Amino acid sequence: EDFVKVEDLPLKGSMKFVYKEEHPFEKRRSEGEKIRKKYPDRVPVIVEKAPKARIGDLDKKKYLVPSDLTVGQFYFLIRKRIHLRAEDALFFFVNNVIPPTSATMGQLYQEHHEEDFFLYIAYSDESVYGL
């Protein structure tokens, strides 16, 4: 076979969240409902590493963030927890799309939260999962 075999790129929708494998729907839905009632100005977020990414692991998965925090500021928060420089690449994906840095986390949540009331974000060193 004379071909360049393309086997190292992540195909759409292949992401799987450990958080959802380990905690069943009714228990996530329960907690997400409660936290959204108790803190209406904040959103609950799950962050895990995208398929095939080459990048440092994240220590913590679950974040409770102000609705008015921007995506650009959440990139800063995550960079710091993984000990990346500002010059090191980092991309987020929500429902397989790269969100704009100008959006707020509250806008992302309203448009994209799942039915357990959490917003799910994947991260990588490259953009390709979202293209």
Residue numbers in the entry: -13 to 117
Paper text:
We recently showed that the CS protein PCM1 binds directly to GABARAP through a canonical LIR motif regulating GABARAP-specific autophagosome formation and GABARAP stability. To elucidate the molecular basis of the PCM1-GABARAP interaction, we determined the crystal structure of the PCM11951–1964 LIR motif bound to GABARAP. The structure was solved in two different space groups P212121 and P43 at a resolution of 1.55 and 1.86 Å, respectively. Both structures displayed identical canonical LIR interactions comprising PCM1 hydrophobic residues F1955 (Θ0) and V1958 (Γ3) deeply bound to HP1 and HP2, as well as three hydrogen bonds formed between the main chains of PCM1 LIR residues V1956 (X1) and V1958 (Γ3) and the main chains of GABARAP residues K48GAB and L50GAB. On top of these canonical LIR interactions additional specific contacts were observed in both PCM1:GABARAP structures. Within the core LIR motif, V1956PCM1 in position X1 formed a hydrophobic interaction with Y49GAB of HP2. Notably, the adjacent C-terminal region engaged in multiple interactions: (1) a salt bridge between E1959PCM1 (X4) and R28GAB, (2) a large hydrophobic contact between L1961PCM1 (X6) and L55GAB, F62GAB, L63GAB, and (3) two hydrogen bonds between the side chain of Q59GAB and the main chain of P1962PCM1 (X7), as well as K1964PCM1 (X9) through a water molecule. Our structural analysis showed that the region C-terminal to the PCM1 core LIR motif contributes to stabilizing GABARAP interaction. Why is the X2 LIR residue of PCM1 affecting binding to LC3s more than GABARAPs? Both M359ULK1 and M446ATG13 (position X2 in the ULK1 and ATG13 LIRs) form hydrophobic interactions with Y25GAB and L50GAB, whereas the charged and longer side chain of K1957PCM1 only partially engages with the hydrophobic surface of GABARAP. Whereas mutation of the GIM motif residues (X1 and Γ3) had opposing or only mild effects, mutation of the lysine in position X2 (K1957IPCM1) dramatically increased both LC3 subfamily (LC3B: 95-fold; LC3A/LC3C: 75- and 47-fold, respectively) and GABARAP subfamily (~12-fold) binding.
Mammalian ATG8 proteins comprise two subfamilies, namely LC3s (LC3A, LC3B, and LC3C) and GABARAPs (GABARAP, GABARAP-L1, and GABARAP-L2). ATG8 proteins promote autophagosome formation, elongation, and closure, as well as fusion with lysosomes. The canonical LIR motif is a small Θ0-X1-X2-Γ3 motif, where Θ represents an aromatic residue (W/F/Y) and Γ an aliphatic residue (L/V/I) (whose side chains bind to hydrophobic pocket 1 (HP1) and HP2 of the LIR docking site (LDS), respectively) and X represents any amino acid (aa). In this study, we examined the molecular determinants that regulate selective binding of the centriolar satellite (CS) marker protein PCM1 (pericentriolar material 1) and the ULK1 complex to GABARAPs.
